[PDB]
């Protein structure tokens, strides 16, 4: 097995994804060896997902013949599940990412969002607390929880966060449709 | 790829150790398919090590590794590791599972770290050290009669380089 293929596979398994704008060599190596990487990851019940438009390569749970495997009981998955509050915040961030990606042209940039923009839109649904410090603590805690899934970054000195492109593959239309169906079932009885 | 082979490989990669007494089916599947496991773990720069004497299957870095973090342990953990290793060696020289009472190790810890002057302090120190070693998966759960079980992995605790370092540190501590 070639050294570069092994290095790229190990790096991707370690971090969970490869981005072209940060690790171009490994991204190119892993992009041109789809069959080899798939054969390597088959024994581990894992698969590789590709996105050439955004320059992204990520790792997902391989789909089995069982109708429902729940995709979270896989032994190698270490994170916890996602509850309703985090799903709501993810939906808000996805809307912001749509807005960012629509009005962009050729060139490299990043999606930055300030907390003060996020606070009122979440107040609309969750409600309002007495002081401002309470709401700031709530938002900071939620963003810290979301950082563990690799969806955002830590707060800057100017009180801003970066939205990672991987969210575009977490809230793709299929997953959104499934979530909407499930939530509609939950609400109506 | 057979389902049992994949299950055994995934379990071993999750835990790092396989014992026949705990998961006999996975142990049998892994021990009868050495070449398949080696082929599977080759791209990940990992290899399988077998100890049929105790039924222990472990993973070694075949050749500082992207998937593995190196750690260093303090003297308060190193001397307890030495004590547990020598206790397990004494137990296996007598010929199952090595059972060590909590009160047994208290004098051995006091003769090297001094006496705290309180039974509660000694109990808390022993419990904290045992929990820290439980984090590394070196001992089993505490028994009802204040006893712990030493896992066979202590036999392959490290290479002889670390054993030499451990015995040198133990001798220096005994010197005081």
């Amino acid at each position: 097995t070639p050294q570069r293929v092994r290095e790229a596979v190990q790096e991707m398994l370690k971090y969970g994804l490869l981005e072209e704008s940060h690790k171009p060599n490994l991204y190119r190596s892993a992009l041109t060896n789809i069959e080899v990487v798939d054969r390597i990851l088959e024994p581990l019940d894992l698969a590789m997902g590709v996105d050439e438009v955004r320059g992204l390569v990520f790792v997902t749970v391989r789909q089995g013949e069982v109708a429902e495997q729940d995709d979270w009981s896989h032994p190698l998955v270490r994170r916890q599940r996602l509850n309703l509050e985090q799903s709501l915040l993810i939906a808000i961030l996805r809307q912001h990412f749509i807005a960012y990606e629509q009005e962009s042209g050729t060139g490299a940039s990043q999606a930055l969002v300030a907390v003060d923009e996020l606070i009122p839109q979440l107040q609309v649904y969750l409600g309002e607390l007495g002081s401002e410090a309470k709401e700031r603590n709530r938002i900071i805690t939620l963003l810290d929880q979301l950082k563990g899934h690799g969806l955002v970054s830590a707060l800057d000195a100017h009180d801003r966060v970066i939205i990672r492109p991987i969210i575009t593959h977490l809230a793709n239309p299929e997953n959104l449709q499934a979530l909407v169906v499930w939530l509609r079932e939950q609400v109506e009885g | 790829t057979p389902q049992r082979v994949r299950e055994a490989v995934q379990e071993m990669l999750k835990y790092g150790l396989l014992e026949e007494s705990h998961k006999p089916n996975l142990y049998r599947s892994a021990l009868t398919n050495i070449e398949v496991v080696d082929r599977i773990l080759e791209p990940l720069d990992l290899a399988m090590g077998v100890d049929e004497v105790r039924g222990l299957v472990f993973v070694t870095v075949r050749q500082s590794h992207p998937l593995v973090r190196r750690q260093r342990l303090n003297l308060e953990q190193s001397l307890l590791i030495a004590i547990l290793r020598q206790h397990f060696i004494a137990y296996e020289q007598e010929s199952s599972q090595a059972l060590v009472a909590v009160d047994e190790l208290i004098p051995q810890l006091q003769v090297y770290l001094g006496e705290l002057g309180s039974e509660a302090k000694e109990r808390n120190r022993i419990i904290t050290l045992l929990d820290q070693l439980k984090g590394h998966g070196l001992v089993s759960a505490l028994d009802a009669h204040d006893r712990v079980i030493i896992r066979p992995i202590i036999t392959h605790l490290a290479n002889p380089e670390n054993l030499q370092a451990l015995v040198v540190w133990l001798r220096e501590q005994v010197e005081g």
Binding site: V61, L170, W182 | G16
Partner: peptide
Amino acid sequence: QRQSERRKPACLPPVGVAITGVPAIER
């Protein structure tokens, strides 16, 4: 307004699955 519903698990698949930290063999 209920903490029970805010922490109820939702349905969203694991994407970008990182490995389980280590193979649990520190050495």
